[PDB]
Design a protein around this ligand. Structure first.
Ligand SMILES: CCCCCCCCO[C@@H]1O[C@H](CO)[C@@H](O)[C@H](O)[C@H]1O
Ligand SMILES: CCCCCCCCO[C@@H]1O[C@H](CO)[C@@H](O)[C@H](O)[C@H]1O
Ligand SMILES: CCCCCCCCO[C@@H]1O[C@H](CO)[C@@H](O)[C@H](O)[C@H]1O
Ligand SMILES: CCCCCCCCO[C@@H]1O[C@H](CO)[C@@H](O)[C@H](O)[C@H]1O
Ligand SMILES: CCCCCCCCO[C@@H]1O[C@H](CO)[C@@H](O)[C@H](O)[C@H]1O
Lengths: 266, 257, 257, 257, 257
């Protein structure tokens, strides 16, 4: 346990993010574009597996998918690129610790979200171009899943988004709490396995699911209005999970009782 | 044989725990709540697996569940949060070695247990709101496991609680004996694999098994007395394993001539 | 972060490649022949798996193939040898950073591509002499995959090439951002799993698919023009993925404005 | 290479073991009882797996059991506790190297073996009390395995005991030759997978097999004479494996010329 | 790249090998006997797996065998012992680099191969003594594999030997290029997976195949003439793989010229 020094690290990470965005908007967006595409890469893989195993009628489908998703956030952490869902915790913590402002935060949130989206779009276009989604069980898996995510009640999506970002941000948190790159990756594998297989909802990952589906030639049963719906619900859920739970939580754990230079702890 | 070193570390962690509690009840409770929720997260995953593979008739169900539970304690150890079952060995070793009093130990136990339960209630509530336990195999898996755990005889729950916490605490003990975070996670993986697949009982994990089931409107036979009955029996077993075996054992190996 | 240091690292690597080729063509080409052979070894392993599981009607075939391909880039990275696809990002980043020139880049690309191919030819020849492709499902998996890769339309091949090298180059990128060799190998394993199972195309691996198919006794529809066609389409796609995305992207991330 | 430094370290461990026993019999026996229990925990896990998979008619049963046994020696090594079988190599090398006496070695063997059995006995008692061996495939697995282990000809048991302790002791030798805890656990995992799946015999793991089978009222296939018969023949082969092969061998590798 | 550094490490290792042999024949031979037996342990495990899964008609047999062979060379590398196949690259590179003579190289090859053989013979005898090859699918897997290896044409064996020792030697080369013991083991794992599942031939592993096959009364399918035929062809292939590819290749990469 050193929660204080962890709090200092999240604060420094928040500071550097806003400093970077102010410095170069292109640098910051390109960083966010990579991250969105890196996450999407995980989606292409596990949806391929979904199509493959669903068509075969395997009971192991959802387990294999979760076991296979680690690459999404592992690429993000190992490239040091900008992922919206992680910024929920980092910027929240930083702000409570007075390193960054509410404006600084909404800004990072806004642009990371947008750049991630750009990444998914580019990935979506390129993947469809491969013809792997022209016809088949994988194409169908994208179709069916895109539809289900858009057709499900806001409350359900909302809560799934909370639990997702608790898991995604806690893996990010572990990355702050260890110097071992291999331990980072392992904690990410565990958290992404738990979140994918348990059926929680990740906003950035969905950007690619719909990106691929709306760019896909075969029918739709998608209704881009649906994509927006899903994305709104999951995003707010994510924010709560990251900002309300992990951000505030790590702040509470690490803030020195002294200071006390504002507020007092029971 | 770093046994004296190890006991010095347990004792120091025990001291740090109670000082934290005395310094801040909110910080102690929040840390406890996180650890309760992180463990419950393991349960959500392995019960999803449980539902899926049970409904398939697979012989691999309990093996895959065991292999998949590592995240529970991995998250706890890697976040530095407060977990009741682990405090059983730490506070007992630290007390035997005169770093902390019995009152300190009793308090730390009461508070982490209550913190953990709070974490489980929040998780159980939020999980239910996802609608994932509304209906189907995962819902049924919660409903049936909760019931069999609440109706099992006391001596059996108790002895299962003993073996579980020997495994949970020995994995915490390993984390004190290595500087390698990967090796910590590996040993956690092994010990949680052994305890889940063998059929041992974890009090804090059960808190989520019960919060989910009770909070789920999809019908169940457990109730509160059922949940309380299991929790009491498993907690007592957990304490015996952690304190009487691991705490006393490590104190004996580590104590000064 | 450390994007600037990462760009410095790629620029330095890109500089050392051209300096090496300028000092010794033999060394450069020997290094390239090794890498081409190391990648092809991954192809032998997973096509053997392909032949085995396809024959069995397993739904797991492509998944097991992906999980088992890690050796291909792990060997290259752990031996420090010269792979054409990795050089798409390294040389493009170093070129934008003015460590090396465009001519340096096309020279390095030409030499590593050809040297890679020499390794593939050598490997295919020796593999055929083992008798392991004389007949049976492995021989058939080689014939069938070669045929389908060569008969696929250009656009599809090109885009699969793009996504393949994004993954391969981002694995190399990771190897520059960690001092942990285990972490390098793990990231390579994840990226190669993703690209093999997703259906993406790697020019250098395809060299072995084709040298094996064309050197072996078992009759196919492939021919030579087919191999060349596939290799042209996938190479261009690989170049776009490694150069336009990873090379340009890491340069933009690390460049002092 | 470091054969000399390795022998030095084995010698030192032999010296530290005898000193520990001389200083405190209790500390020594308690360490021994932990190790015997930790080994036994691996048996509880894999016999659970055995009952589940056998009951299912799985061809993978013995493979999954081997893969799942690593916890047994991993716990011992990571907690630094006293295991009879490892002491076959350590004491024999140490004695050969003039660090410890023949009588010292005899004493460490007797105490560690008996203390290990104390751990198995205690574990068997508690595990029976879980009700997990009451009736079903896990109880049948214990009962069937214990009977076949007690009815197997001496020669076959003895030789199985030799190969077993070459594997266990070589995994302890590896832990002496690396500073990476993660690599220690990997090597233990491999060697334990090899010995369980191949069919080799480990005296201390067997103590738990017989303690569970004998303490359980719903298991009557063996009795005590059957257990002694097996344990005597497996212990003798263990000794030969660890002392005559590993101990003598590493001494010959490391000794001053 | 650090190709010169690697060649220097290889050259130092060759020098150290020949000094060892010159210093003590007994030490050199004991070391070789260990490696031969450690490699054979891997054979005992994967042939138990082969017999189990072949008898069940599993498509996964050769895949699980390849995945399970890592112990063979992991033990050799972690105990620092003398393996003939590895010495093909090490002595070869150190010779080209003028650290050791052609005669030193012949000597080291001769002694390690014979020593490796002594370990295989001992392991064979003891394994037969376990009764584990008395009868059933494991004995039959041994009998059938020995026979197919004995009847295979020379060219096909030779080329299989080449590819096998590229893999074994590149895995040894990897261990000279990293300070991470976990990474060494991982690369060894991947290379042995590749060579076993693909169908490549390893001379020292084959020693234990024929050892068990010739010592078991219940295995009739082969003669000493067959074993010798296979061992000669496969050894020659191994030498070409280790010395002419890896040895010469690494010399070329690393030579200051
Ligand atoms: C909002 C939730 C707050 C939970 C705090 C629980 C307070 C318990 O407090 C402690 O309980 C122990 C026994 O149960 C006693 O032994 C201690 O003396 C006592 O301080
Ligand atoms: C409660 C546990 C008591 C354990 C006591 C074990 C002591 C055994 O005693 C030892 O036995 C050997 C042979 O039997 C002798 O050769 C040793 O000299 C002797 O010290
Ligand atoms: C060293 C091997 C393990 C020894 C275990 C001895 C426990 C015996 O104890 C008793 O004996 C009877 C038959 O054995 C059983 O029927 C009883 O249930 C059991 O309590
Ligand atoms: C158990 C006995 C094993 C002894 C093996 C010795 C075989 C030596 O063999 C020879 O050694 C010479 C130099 O020493 C080489 O020059 C020869 O090429 C080589 O054949
Ligand atoms: C089951 C297989 C998982 C293996 C994961 C290995 C991760 C180990 O961790 C790594 O190990 C190295 C030790 O050799 C260290 O040098 C590194 O610091 C460390 O990150």
């Amino acid at each position: 346990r050193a929660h204080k020094e962890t709090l200092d690290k999240l604060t420094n990470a928040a500071i550097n993010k806003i400093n970077l965005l102010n410095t170069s908007k292109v640098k910051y967006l390109v960083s966010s574009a990579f991250a969105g595409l890196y996450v999407g890469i995980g989606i292409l893989l596990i949806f391929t597996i979904g199509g493959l195993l669903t068509d075969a009628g395997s009971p192991m489908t959802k387990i294999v998918m979760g076991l296979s998703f680690a690459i999404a956030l592992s690429l993000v952490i190992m490239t040091g690129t900008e992922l919206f869902t992680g910024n929920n915790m980092v910027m929240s913590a930083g702000m409570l610790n007075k390193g960054v402002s509410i404006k600084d935060t909404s800004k990072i949130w806004a642009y990371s979200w947008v750049g991630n989206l750009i990444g998914a779009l580019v990935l979506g276009i390129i993947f469809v171009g491969t013809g792997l989604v022209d016809k088949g069980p994988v194409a169908e898996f994208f179709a069916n899943t895109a539809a289900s995510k858009a057709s499900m009640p806001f409350t359900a999506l909302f809560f799934r988004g909370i639990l997702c970002n608790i898991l995604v941000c806690v893996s990010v948190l572990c990355s702050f709490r260890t110097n071992s790159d291999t331990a980072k990756i392992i904690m990410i594998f565990l958290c992404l396995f738990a979140f994918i297989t348990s059926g929680f909802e990740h906003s950035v990952a969905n950007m690619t699911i719909y990106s691929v589906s709306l760019f896909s030639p075969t029918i739709s049963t998608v209704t881009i209005g649906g994509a927006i719906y899903n994305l709104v619900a999951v995003t707010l859920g994510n924010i709560v999970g990251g900002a309300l739970f992990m951000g505030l939580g790590t702040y509470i754990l690490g803030k020195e009782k002294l200071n006390a230079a504002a507020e007092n702890l029971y």
